[model samples]
Target: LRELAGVKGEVVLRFAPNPSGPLHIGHARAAILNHEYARKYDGRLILRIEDTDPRRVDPEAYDMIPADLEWLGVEWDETVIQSDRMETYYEYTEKLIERGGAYVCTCRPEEFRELKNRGEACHCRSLGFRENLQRWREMFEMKEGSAVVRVKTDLNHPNPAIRDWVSMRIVEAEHPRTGTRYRVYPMMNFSVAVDDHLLGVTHVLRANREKQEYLYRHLGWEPPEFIHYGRLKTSGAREGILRGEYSGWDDPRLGTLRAIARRGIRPEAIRKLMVEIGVKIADSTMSWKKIYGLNRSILEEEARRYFFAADPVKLEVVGLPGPVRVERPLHPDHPEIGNRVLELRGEVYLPGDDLGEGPLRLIDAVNVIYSGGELRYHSEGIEEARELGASMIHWVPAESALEAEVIMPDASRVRGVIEADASELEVDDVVQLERFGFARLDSAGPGMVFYYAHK
Candidate 1:
């Protein structure tokens, strides 16, 4: 929503993530926050990669990041990779260097730390620009750690960051892409500040990490307007996306933006709740139930229902003479829509446990209770669910059952027993499982339908 409110014609907002790690739940929150803002305002959302650090860089990770974004339904107008913009960073570095606001310093870590500990300035602090620049340029080439580019600022200030921070490092580590072109690597502040100004990002919502704030101001660019918000928290009991990693960001247990989408969380649902939560200065943990519950409400009326079971126990009720199985009209209240006609051929199936329960009642037996004491059942379909204010509903079929492998929240793989419908279902067909939840027909075939559950 912030994006929409802030963006206008030709203006865009970016969701830049450091591709070193998988998109955890925290990232999912950011994705939803940014995507919702962009979508609401009809503004363009750009996906920018912050692939600055070389230590955690992974080539395969890049391939997976965008897929995760798309999975969450987060779309972008343009994509920029930070690694490709080394020249741009160098340009900004020169700009800073040319300005008298920044200068070069060649101080070793132990020497620098000891100097600061003693509250004393270095003798090289007063060196002429000509000598300092030469030393800085050489240090940047990583020849010796004798010259380091530092933002010339008030060393006497109470803030340690103002005591000559490094704008470029003399690291010997080889960059992932830049083999040995330039040894001097611009620090995050030097690059990001320039990137923000170049990209036209007006407001940057950030945590209260005050040191970075000092860096931005030193760069001579207007620091982005910051809006503080609480942090997300999770106890061990709740099992957040980061608690246990099944694999990468795609793990169902993780609450990454893409994972949420893969779990059936619509963009609308995520946006609405984030807005309700609003911005605050304190950190607080939000429960998955709160978000999921909201999503369930948002998608309740729009979603189609189908049946899913893991290791389904097929029950063929052949004795029902004349194929007496009833259609149950899928959702009886949605008669105008002609409803989803499930061919209940009396062949009942269930999970191993449900099969042991003798007769399975299917979705007809399940009741969804609303706040006002309203109860909804799959027999009612979308119309009834809507009228009753049901949050969401799953649909199921009685015949053609199969096992559906799905990633659980714990990153563990589990098979959902899917009720098969020999009836033709399009790939786009919306699916609801009777008592389970809702899914879209992912794959369709002559005898089976693949459906996925969304959060």
Candidate 2:
């Protein structure tokens, strides 16, 4: 909960991400943190899509990224697209070259690597402004890998990468927005820092001020106070999320915010989790259990209890106290939550997993012995079943139970029967199945279909 430093007249933060794919938890952390900070300080939050690298861009991600952010309740005051601001980058680069802070290098990458590795300056570094400016213009007509524009720095800097970094280069890949109309494109570090300065952003948050600050100081502009956060490592999904290579994850519900919302995970739970995790510089692992625990807390009072039997078997009750009626509270603690009344007399469906030798109470209906797929009435009260050390299980009366199935996050489905009253609940109504996990009603056409959320 440490506050952001250098909060001045107005705070300005942005969640800039490449349109690689739909956002995952790692992306969520950055999005939520920036949004919360912006809201807390009454600042302008920007949604910047850094899509300069055409090779890694996903066309669908342009729309998907924003949709995902919206689902998480992340709002932005302004939106900027890097591709649309090509001329601005070119103008900045020209200014940089005119100031002798940058130059155009036509040397092969390996050739320059050898020079850079030896802590020596390449011949291109000594090129004057006029010559570099001419070379920078020629960059657009040059082949993709033949030439690049570089920003100069101390050759003796500890990190070889900081010595002289490529600011812009030619990429032949057709951009989703710009297509092949332009060959030269600004590299991320250059365009980003340049944009932050020109956009009048006061604070920049990332997962660095390192390589970028050099650009700012050299360009004769005050750099935004960059706050860096540690890498977020999730036990699943996020490591290869950008590449869409989730090794062991088969669930799309856990992959994207859109999918998570489809399964009824509220945006509030996500926001709360990120707020708790905050922005830590130390690397951390995201636990699914922790997220589920948070979601459970949020849902406890919202979802109503209902009976659902998986792998159910028909159990005929032989003894009945003349149509006993059982009324159970929808929420155990909240009396105002209402109740679901059931009439039990002839038959009820019980989960096969709960069928075994011993007296079992059909919840509050009756006490019976389950043997040979039949229930023989042993007693009329739960106290009798308790004295005999019986197990209490939920049962759906055959007449009042609707045929249903719960689809898990992994897509595996369990055949079941839900209470007929569930038909009254519309699609997207999340409900807790007694003894089972919570699930959202997805469809009721033909049969009831539910998406299992979590236990």
Candidate 3:
């Protein structure tokens, strides 16, 4: 990634998220890029909530957006909510109107659309500054959809959408923060252009060139550096969330940041992934496995190991010499994490599907010969088990194992038995289950529940 230009004074970047929904992983990509740029330049990252459309903005997401960013380790130096600055937007609206750069459109929606499609100016475009100002004031008292305030642009421009775009409109919806104190609301492009200038933001991030620069130039202000990047997506991503096919924003099936966090993905891993993908304009869709693989690499050395039996079947091992206790390291690769001891009586449980009429090593323990629904001691030597090419399987002593469940990505729950020490894990602690997979502790009360991260 090249260094951002226009770092004249105190370098500043802003991440403006519309509070319409919870931040998905696609949104997190942009946020992480902006944050990393700010950190690289030793500048400031500002969090701005573009809540101009009160109807679409989610009330709960006002605070949820920041919390999600914080959980991703992306902190902002300042916060700005556009709804709180309605007066500021209004002041700028007046300034633009008085400056003869904007006008009030009394034309109906279809009429304006027909005129724009034919590359012609609307009747309101010819209004003088005084006449436009009078009509602009009338918009405040006007009912919704009756009139709108539009910025004057090149009618003959190649893009019809850019010609006289609406700067403000009459929205009757009560804003979460502002209530019904104001009926006139500024559109995104207008409000965003004004905010960037007023906040002295040095850089702005967006997916496309939405021509916000038009408003900036009309107001005689320098537009910040627009760092455009392609969107990050996965095939069939967000379709479930949008179609109401998923449970909620935090549903494991979705790629929402909350879902990823719940699955024990480290924020640093995401940052590293973004760094590798970096500031490119190319549109790319990555598979979920890419994210899981990157996360697995980081978690391998950090997460402790334990044994869990899903769909457990009882086994009677008769050759054991009385009570035996075996100590297994919390992580075979990480000895500093200590170990947990499993007390074995004559009874134990193995995965129901793993039983076969052959020799199998009970992972870190002795080899057992399984035949006719019974288990017999095969050999204590690791070499003897290895010579037989015995498949390694995980088991838990039936007497002490605790009942547990893990929620998979498809929202399916896997009922299982966990080693007794799993109860000691606090919520959010990620652990590796031998022969199963890594899982994050989601809850710890009655019969601990975990969210399966990856295998």
Candidate 4:
């Protein structure tokens, strides 16, 4: 529901995801809880893509982010792509400069580096307002290097932020959106403060690892109400050792939902796992396995079971029977799914050269299976199949079978004879293997019936 500002009060919140990398676990907590909170409270959630650092940002990271959030069941009512709002950002920043609230600092990177070394402000802070404005126009108009707009503050104040913080700076790089339009980029804090106020964000919730809040408040700039939460902490090791957090990720590792997802975890499982931990801002580290285990427990009862077959063996049962159709229910206990009836079907493909007799293993542990119009069970006669030590061994009874393609462990495509009749299943259905793992039907394209690599 749209809240007319004066007509009613709405808890308008924003999820400012800096599309610099894959969303981590911390991001997961913020995203999931923010969504849940909005739903429960009848509030609105805004998606703000913070890509202030052109040098450090990956354009692909922006495109790849939202799908993962959708998978986790989180959605936003509106969005603010930072790249699209630069002109708006510049307006507020320039307003401050024109009002004599900030100054143009023409210090080169080397010069600023030296000032940072001296732990003090450079002479640029003492430049006159007109001169500062002229310098700022030149820097912005020229499209070049590190000249920046520094927020002019009480240099002698006890707080460090009062000591000339940067508002805008020059970076000559290809921006994902703005492109070569402008080289001067506003600092993240300045942009956030202005954007929050402009977007009418009522509540600001985030972790406190950044130093921008000090710059925002101490500089006498009030944008929105804020609540800083504690860092997520876990026991087991010294927090000191886990410092270089995001660097360890080859692909947006530990902190993200995708990191666990890469290991084939379900998004629902991750959400349940996050709920078990609750939301807190604290310095903590815990093994990912523990979280995975938690999600696994939650999914065990809810996730539909499927079949997988690392290796399959079939048997031809001869004589002893009239035509009997065996009914296989998708879920035995949950019978509303109805029944999939199979006749003693076609020729069953087995691992052995001869089906002359012995035990036949069933993946679902249904010891006695009717295949090729006869009854069969696990066979010790096929010792070679046992030596492969496969995860979920499977077999199928078919009327007319054909070779199917599968992605093998070595990344090569392999062909195997599979039941031809079952080829038309959709991607989401659960498939029962005769003995192996549960598989979700997945197709790479038309005429492909490969199962998902479900974890």
Candidate 5:
């Protein structure tokens, strides 16, 4: 949110992340921040994948990044890629050189560094526009490292990086999409700022790359409001993505939107989360604990409750005369929806850790006690357990329980059994496991898989 002087035309915002890899939670702050502002003003949001450098661009990420934003509920009115519009910026290169705002620096790296350190212009800076233009065209034929186009900025400016920045260069690596079409490549600032001008982008909600302003000034266009938020960095996630330590972007060990979505986090929750966090001056950190609370708030009424018994133990009840039937609401607060009907024949599966000395109610099943290393029927009615201050624990009917494998946040699987009716659940259904935490139904069939969210 750039709190500028006053109102203006329709707010145009862009979330441009390079396709180095799929977006992780680190990218969400900028993406969601731009999206929220666009929504607030009913403006156009553009998704620009800045992929000029072939070496850093991931071919798969070109598709994956868009899908990630789609899951995050980021609506983009237009899409732009730097590779598609290289020629567009090439025209500006000539225009900038003609305006004396740019020049071709052929000095070797160390030679240029020494010259820059002395705070003096190179011999090339004195060349006329006609000569520089000739060199610009000839640069295509020049070897990759022999020539580069650098934007002329303040030689006297305190920051050495701003003195003269490389605008475009020749890269020989084959681009994933447009391979060998052109050897000359524009850097991020040249492409983005020029595209913003051409597309009439009114606002750029991103970080501190003040260089774009210089590019705008050189081209004789009014630069849009460039608000710099404190950079966002989430810890210890993308390293694995960078190192190939994990399977892919959706590897359960990651915080990528794919990983979060696979674990059943709603996009709305993520949107609201980042939006509420707001575009603060100081950089902020994100944690799963807060996200889980918000997610649970949304899922509280939506998710159906069922019993899950991990590492369960068989319970034997001696006093049951016949099979007992129990009909429990899937969501107690939403009684009209449906019920998890169960019939138990004097035995059920209970999580062993829940066992205790006496009178534990097996949900709607019979109350029992732990004695002689077995269960003895205490009473038929829940009133007996309630009156005796006996604790109630969820149980799954051993006869019809469905086997399930729950993948925890740690990427460890917890083998368990869920309610029989859960077998009918489609993939991606989120449910509460009664005594356990909320879990997303990830896979279904021979053996089901669930991704455990927080309690």
Candidate 6:
């Protein structure tokens, strides 16, 4: 509601995402927050690609992040790629060694872990600047994981992981952007801290700030204002994407941004939801309903109404019914949007579940008396049908219905027929089916497919 804390004149915020995987919904909150914060103050928002980990980085993800960010309506003033700044990182690494703040360590991984756990330092930690420089250069030629550059922190630091963390290590894997030209790559903590200062980033949003703060201070530089927030978990399985258990990043069940978009969530809804909730340090798990419900609220007023019958059972209305032209408003709340017409020729289809022996009112049409085996015209006025306690049902003329299928959130398909007018709807158009919840038109070819959003 007000200017963010620690933001002064010409505020600058950066959102750095690793190009190793597609961004999930959990990442969207931070992206939106930084974007909105920058916008609120007329500041610059920078999109930084933290693609330092060559082995894990996905080449496709480098292109996907920007597309998704633009889709979310986030605008960035500048962009920086960590891989492109490898020489800068190398310069900073050498500076740390020259200042006696960092050294090259050849200690095995298990050996270093044991030493760190015991709050001790390896002999490599005491290497002179000349030897350290030699080892650093040797890391360029050494096999992957053979040599590592570590910053010197307190040997007896309470947090063992912070005692002496690796700043740069040999990763011989071919980088999508840099290729195998460089074997030494800066770790996230080191790269992020360096970029924040070098790029003039005024604010850093992260889940953890302690390590980055330490890295900044080790380099004798003050860290930018750090805002720590918690993780958003939709599933108990925390590593589904990394474990390859999910189909793809866009799987509806996953919390990825692409998945949420595919589920018919508006990017504005996501921004609104996160801004309203603000930031918190405690981790939280939310069910799909919470987000879906929030999105449904925003869509209800805007989504046009249509008639859709799932697993339709043929209904032949008998006795005295002539060809009736029925007009249904596109949106009940907004008549200015216009209306759609349905021509009823006494032959219609109703959802199988709604077919029972009772009085039923065909939505926007005449009331019909539904017997165990026959459907007959009951009344003309919907008010009179209402007086008779008739159940309201949606129906579409069999002749004009269009083949439609709804892809539910669970990836299951619900086959149905919507009004022929629905066929005219373009992709990304959100509409409400009478008696059915709101759905977004995803595909308009062959069999029209909609992604069921929410009620």
Judged by whole-model lDDT over C-alpha atoms, candidate 5 comes out at 0.82
Q: What would the TM-scores of all predictions be?
A: 0.71, 0.92, 0.93, 0.68, 0.91, 0.92
lDDT per residue for candidate 5 within 1-455, as digits (tens), equals: 44533349788888999887778876887889988888888888888888898877678888999998987888889999888988888899999999999999888977887888779889898899999999999988777878889888878767787778888898887889898787899987788888888887887766226677788888799988766666545224445766876666777887888888888888888878887778777887767888988999999978988889987887767787788889999997897878988988866788877466776888877777877778778787868888867778888888888888888887888887888888878898999988789989888967899988888
In candidate 5, stretches whose alpha carbon ends up further than 4 angstroms from where it belongs are 1-6, 232-245, 353-359, 380-389
Residue pairs clashing in model 6 are none
**What tens digits encode model 4's per-residue C-alpha lDDT throughout 1-455?**
22223323676778888766657667877787667657756888988888877766666667767877887889889978888877887777667765666777767767775665456677877777678768877886665555778776545545545456777888888887677786878777778877777787776766121334544554455545565545663111113223643332322224455544533456776677566555455555555666656655544443443332233354555442344454555556667755544454434554332333333443432234444546543222224335534233344454544455444222244344554445545555444443332334446334444432333
Pick the lDDT winner: 3
Q: lDDT by residue for model 6 over 1-455, one digit each (tens)?
A: 34467766688899888886677777788899898888888899999998888867777788899998998899999989989999999999998898898999898889888888888789998889899999888888899878889888777877777777888988768888888799888988889888889988887765136667766776788778877777776233235755775556776676678877876788888888778766767887766677777888888878888999999888798873588888989988999978899998878989987467888888878888888788899777878897879888899998988899888778788998889888779998888887877888888868998888777
Model 1: weakest 10-residue lDDT segment is 369-378
Local accuracy of candidate 1 as per-residue lDDT tens digits, 317-398: 4334323233445444456655444554444544543332112234532223322322222232455545645443233345
lDDT of each: 0.57, 0.82, 0.84, 0.57, 0.82, 0.82
RMSD of 5: 2.8
Model 5 CA lDDT for position 298: 94
Q: TM-score for model 6?
A: 0.92
TM-score, candidate 4, is 0.68
Model 4: residue 279 alpha-carbon error in angstroms = 1.7
Error of 1 at 98 (Å): 4.9
Clashes of 4: 36
Better of 2 and 6 by TM-score: 2
Off by over 4 Å in 2: 234-253, 333-337
Q: Native-vs-model 3 lDDT?
A: 0.84
